[PDB]
Design an enzyme around this catalytic site. Sequence first.
Site, short mmCIF file in Angstrom:
data_model
loop_
_atom_site.label_atom_id
_atom_site.label_comp_id
_atom_site.label_asym_id
_atom_site.label_seq_id
_atom_site.Cartn_x
_atom_site.Cartn_y
_atom_site.Cartn_z
CE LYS A 38 -2.04 5.52 -2.87
NZ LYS A 38 -2.83 4.50 -2.13
CG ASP A 95 -2.02 1.06 1.14
OD1 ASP A 95 -2.21 1.65 0.06
OD2 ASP A 95 -2.69 1.30 2.17
#
Length: 357
Positions: A306, A277
Amino acid sequence: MNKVVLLCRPGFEKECAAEITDKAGQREIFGFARVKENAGYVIYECYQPDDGDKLIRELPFSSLIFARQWFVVGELLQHLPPEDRITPIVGMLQGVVEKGGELRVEVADTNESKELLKFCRKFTVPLRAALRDAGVLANYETPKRPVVHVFFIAPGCCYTGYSYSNNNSPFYMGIPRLKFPADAPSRSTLKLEEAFHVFIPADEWDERLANGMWAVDLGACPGGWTYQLVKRNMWVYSVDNGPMAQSLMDTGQVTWLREDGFKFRPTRSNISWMVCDMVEKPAKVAALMAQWLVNGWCRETIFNLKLPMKKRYEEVSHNLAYIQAQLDEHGINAQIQARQLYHDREEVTVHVRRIWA
């Protein structure tokens, strides 16, 4: 029925609409989707009058990134009278679905529909009894019969329809019900937990998210994702320059490697899981993920990418294409899924399972 409702994150209707138009179009299931900004849903209206059913049978739901859930619907019911709430809905569904398996009365995931959501959750009980009496629902809940959806877009205004239980989200509003545990070191823990629910069939958890598996968590600090791995009784290498929460270290399941996750190279050859992450450019994350997969450093991975500001569907599809290009070049077979999870904002979560011959 030609209309298919897709539930999405409010503000991502354009992505959701672009994606379904694209992927349905690839199958010659032509149609259009209007985009109501921040509505939290999109309706794809097929040109052909029964292509709605064909679309939700043939296009794999797992292939949609920006839809949390979908279902085919009929015409909009407006002005449902409070003194007569049952008959008009029964009438809409009679002869559309018989002996269905489950009822979900849902709304768009907006703040404005928050009071309507409470109504829907309660209305479910008496409506389910009535639909059962009318033969629309089986008297006993059945996992393999279609899910019946009644979808309220406003007070007194709803669509009715269905989805197939082998080609949809198993969750209410496409959102797994999760409680944040107070002893978890970050709220990001819910992203990974939701991913486990969305990507791994519940009857496969004990086998694929197994007690005793080795995992690596890249950019782990302070341990939100490591926490989920530990709760599945895995042994985790938590890789970051920042320190891991002491609560995790005390379990004796966590080894802290003080390194940059981007530079980390595993020496251990039996890592089942790698998760990531890390906040970085998606093209760069995608390349690291592809390294791990191509080199066989993990068997399955879950990681976040993202989204950019514009052309989000295009760009994330391109990121995914990069990974696939790397897999193809090396003759590696893998299954890729991706989904903008409920706990995802301007990002999507990806799951890849690699196969060995």
